[PDB]
Amino acid sequence: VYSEKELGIPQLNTVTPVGVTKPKGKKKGKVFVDDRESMNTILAMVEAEKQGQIESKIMRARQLEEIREARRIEAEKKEAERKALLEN
Amino acid sequence: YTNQLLKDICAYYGYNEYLAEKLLNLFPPREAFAFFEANETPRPVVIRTNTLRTHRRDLAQALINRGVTLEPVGKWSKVGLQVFDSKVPLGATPEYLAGHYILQAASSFLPVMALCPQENERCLDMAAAPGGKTTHMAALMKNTGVIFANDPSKSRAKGLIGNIHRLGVRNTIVCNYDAREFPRVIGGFDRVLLDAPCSGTGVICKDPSVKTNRDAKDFMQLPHTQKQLLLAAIDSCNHASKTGGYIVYSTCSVCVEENEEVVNYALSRRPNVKLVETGLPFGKEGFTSYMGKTFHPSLKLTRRFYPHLYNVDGFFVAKFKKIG
Amino acid sequence: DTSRESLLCTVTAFALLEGQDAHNARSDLHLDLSFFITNLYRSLLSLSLNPDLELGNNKINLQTTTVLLLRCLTSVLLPPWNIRSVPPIRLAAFCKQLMTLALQVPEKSSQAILGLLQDVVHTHGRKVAALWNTEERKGDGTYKPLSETVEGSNPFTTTIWEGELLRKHYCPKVREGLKAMEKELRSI
Amino acid sequence: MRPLTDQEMKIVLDKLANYMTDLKSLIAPLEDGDRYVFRMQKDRVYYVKLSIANIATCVARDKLLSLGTCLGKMTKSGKFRLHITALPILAQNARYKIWVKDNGAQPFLYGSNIVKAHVGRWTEDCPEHSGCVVYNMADIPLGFGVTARSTAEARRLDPTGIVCFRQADCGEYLRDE
Amino acid sequence: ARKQRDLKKFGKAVQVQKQLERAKQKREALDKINQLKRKRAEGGALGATEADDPFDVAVDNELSRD
Amino acid sequence: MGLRYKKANVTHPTLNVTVQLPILSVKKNPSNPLYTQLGVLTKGTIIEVNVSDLGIVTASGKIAWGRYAQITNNPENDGCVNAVLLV
RNA sequence: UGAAGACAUUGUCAGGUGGGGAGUUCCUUUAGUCCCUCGAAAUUUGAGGCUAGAGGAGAAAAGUUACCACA
């Protein structure tokens, strides 16, 4: 038994797509984000992770939609930053 | 005669021939002898009460409850508490570990009350090596504003960060910068504070190397460095503010090249500085002339502190105002 | 309803700890109320808002929530066992909220709330007297009246001024207990 | 002074929430309108007001030493550790508290795990492993740690039996001197 | 398992070269201090207090003064 | 506590004097770099000693405060710690 | 047309930082010229300049410890 990260396993094209695979070690990059209101929803997400899944289907769907609205807000800020970079 | 007095004093106290001659000059003869007793003699141990987590009376009751013999010291301080005897070590008490009180000296108290730090005010400290002054200033603004802690040595910075975060300060940033370069970095503060590197004649009990290891060459470069240190203090403060901001000049030396000469050089080079009454309760006025050279009569408002009069270390305090 | 049912459950769990064999079972069980005082602290606002406090040898089955609040608030700040072993922030916060209870309460519940809190000060004294005096005030951070925990609020920063508001309350009855509160305070 | 990313944000608040009861007061807008923001310097994270964070951007990154209150350290494997620097905010709104006697108070300062014979009073609703913050009589914050055993099981051990674990204690301020 | 088999067969041999180099580290450090002995006994030119560099940096600085 | 020493007997090859001066720090124990960190006093271990009482005049007219001193005895076998100044 | 109100706010220069975005593939240790510049000192110093002895796939993660816990 060994860790999968240590094994050089190629990425497989499942129902979840591979996207564009980045080379390992050679110019591997990452991203950057802090936020104010979306990170407030990450607070709302983590007690929901800590206190477990909600037995109420209404409250579980309501808290998932709040994270969806946070992703929609975070995405709209990202295209706004892309438009600002195109203007500059 | 005087020459017999210098040779006898250097032999029995072990001073260097130079620094004994300089210190003999600034005193009357019987006053010099009483001063040489005290500065070699160890000083009393003093405690600063953290106003944030505790206050004077309930901390005092707590330490006597742990066996510590205390006494409120003076009418000068509502914050100071002298110690006389302690079964438990002072750093061992759980009040210390929470940051209810901090070890200081008396001379670390008075620059902070020379300053008058108010809430929501941007302040500074060019040398905060033990960190007692910085924790005292934050006790007065009640956890508001911002303090820029500065010290040019990383080794002292570890004790700074340890002392600050124990005391619960939450508002200080500490940078390892030469403070000559500091107004180029930011500038525009309210109340700047400077405890310059000095010759250390004011305190020989803590550092007994100044008895001999301080000569003619050291008395030129060291006051030279206070000048570039001190001119940076005006060039970093604000000429105007919603709450008026003042500089404070504090040195741990009794020398006359280190003290009352640097402030003469500063007030001559920058005419947009005045000096008024410094707010400390007691003290002795500075000398307007020492060796044929005249200083402006604003130095009568400066306060000098001496081991023989008060059981404190040798100190100079002066506060500045910025105009333009 | 829910305010009463919690208060019926309130003096209940305080009675189980009040058991002599059960206090001898403090070292034979964890029976701890630090979850439950925090429930009373966050509900002291809601209990103050409800004017249903007075309605038409028993420990639990008393109907009115005025005496239920008393037997609660007696057991919190004056335990039978370990009477003088009480945490300080619990004394500072519950007495400060008692001043808020002294604002929104009817008259009969007021005197007994008043008549309780000299007994709190007369037994504790200097541990709570830091609040009434501003030289004994800690300056850590501003006061947060709506906190989820008793230690979350920091009542050592705020002094007490609602005693002044109770002089403005009917003098003949309420003001008597106020002087009795301040006289026992000076007598300490 | 790199602010935390998405992945790093869930790690710090997770182990925070295993010790905290109200996560909303920590990130709350205050009267001046400025909030408390989390930055990180040299693989350790700092908990700071936003305004003092903003004027901290002037110092050079590998030149600045420390800033505000240190919440803890990022480990090499990506986990998060708490230091006793995090204690003043951690004890401000703690969720489970332990009181120890004076003969057990100094053991924590020397660095022992909490044993049954020193506890002054407990809190309920503690599972077999729950984070807790320890005080003396005077509610002086002494440290934080995890409960060793549950509400029933911790006491049915011996009076020489460890009741709560040591994680961090105020005595580490006595080290860097 | 190839790596495990190599240190299987080496075993004691790693211990022998290990004991030899630490004794070589003892010999060179003692010999380094002996060079400091003949340095100061023949000449010198020092400070009042003493340099805050640790060893093998400080001692190399005094050897560079030759 | 009983295995701790704060003072060592230190010989000065010039002026041929032995005195007691305090130990300031342990610089290098060549037997083990681990033993250097706790400050284990073995043979040929360099310590820093206060040379204030000697008053040896350095260059530029300055009085020394800390010198190298090699421990020349085995302090585990005999109680006294003995050393020679490296001057 | 009313309120705030010379507060903000705004823009331009001169800076600091910049783990972020776009491209891209000199410092360290030591000494001297006590020569030049800026400082300081009742005449001598300090800080920069210049010169010469020795070193050099790229924010994703790497080398090391007479160290800790585990296997």
PDB file of C-alpha atoms in Angstrom, chain E residues 25-26 29-30 33-34 36-37 40-41 45-51 53 55 58-59 62, chain F residues 27-28 30-31 33 44 46 48 58-59 62-68 70 84-87:
ATOM      1  CA  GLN E  25      35.598  14.737  13.217  1.00  0.00           C
ATOM      2  CA  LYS E  26      37.036  14.640  16.738  1.00  0.00           C
ATOM      3  CA  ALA E  29      38.290  19.728  15.636  1.00  0.00           C
ATOM      4  CA  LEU E  30      41.021  19.109  18.212  1.00  0.00           C
ATOM      5  CA  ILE E  33      41.901  24.267  18.190  1.00  0.00           C
ATOM      6  CA  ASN E  34      45.609  23.392  18.372  1.00  0.00           C
ATOM      7  CA  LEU E  36      44.432  28.363  17.448  1.00  0.00           C
ATOM      8  CA  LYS E  37      46.872  27.564  20.260  1.00  0.00           C
ATOM      9  CA  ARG E  40      47.752  33.256  19.850  1.00  0.00           C
ATOM     10  CA  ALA E  41      50.887  31.992  21.610  1.00  0.00           C
ATOM     11  CA  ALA E  45      45.139  42.007  18.305  1.00  0.00           C
ATOM     12  CA  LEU E  46      41.701  40.886  19.507  1.00  0.00           C
ATOM     13  CA  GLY E  47      38.470  42.551  20.580  1.00  0.00           C
ATOM     14  CA  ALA E  48      37.141  43.294  24.041  1.00  0.00           C
ATOM     15  CA  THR E  49      34.237  40.874  23.994  1.00  0.00           C
ATOM     16  CA  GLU E  50      34.273  37.946  21.618  1.00  0.00           C
ATOM     17  CA  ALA E  51      32.833  37.254  18.201  1.00  0.00           C
ATOM     18  CA  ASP E  53      29.956  33.719  14.994  1.00  0.00           C
ATOM     19  CA  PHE E  55      32.794  27.691  15.431  1.00  0.00           C
ATOM     20  CA  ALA E  58      34.976  32.163  13.673  1.00  0.00           C
ATOM     21  CA  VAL E  59      38.080  29.947  13.740  1.00  0.00           C
ATOM     22  CA  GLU E  62      41.284  33.824  12.647  1.00  0.00           C
TER      23      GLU E  62
ATOM     24  CA  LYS F  27      31.078  27.224  22.544  1.00  0.00           C
ATOM     25  CA  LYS F  28      31.960  23.828  21.060  1.00  0.00           C
ATOM     26  CA  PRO F  30      34.108  18.320  19.805  1.00  0.00           C
ATOM     27  CA  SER F  31      32.929  14.940  21.114  1.00  0.00           C
ATOM     28  CA  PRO F  33      27.522  18.563  18.521  1.00  0.00           C
ATOM     29  CA  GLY F  44      38.935  19.861  25.185  1.00  0.00           C
ATOM     30  CA  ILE F  46      35.869  25.497  24.594  1.00  0.00           C
ATOM     31  CA  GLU F  48      33.600  31.549  27.266  1.00  0.00           C
ATOM     32  CA  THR F  58      43.367  44.529  24.595  1.00  0.00           C
ATOM     33  CA  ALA F  59      44.148  46.624  21.542  1.00  0.00           C
ATOM     34  CA  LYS F  62      40.034  48.242  26.013  1.00  0.00           C
ATOM     35  CA  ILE F  63      39.480  45.723  28.811  1.00  0.00           C
ATOM     36  CA  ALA F  64      38.486  42.184  27.860  1.00  0.00           C
ATOM     37  CA  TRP F  65      35.233  40.625  29.034  1.00  0.00           C
ATOM     38  CA  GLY F  66      35.096  37.233  27.321  1.00  0.00           C
ATOM     39  CA  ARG F  67      37.793  34.869  26.049  1.00  0.00           C
ATOM     40  CA  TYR F  68      38.130  31.323  24.776  1.00  0.00           C
ATOM     41  CA  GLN F  70      39.739  25.017  26.638  1.00  0.00           C
ATOM     42  CA  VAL F  84      43.492  27.269  30.310  1.00  0.00           C
ATOM     43  CA  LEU F  85      42.922  30.633  28.650  1.00  0.00           C
ATOM     44  CA  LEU F  86      43.534  30.619  24.915  1.00  0.00           C
ATOM     45  CA  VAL F  87      45.553  33.839  24.948  1.00  0.00           C
TER      46      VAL F  87
END
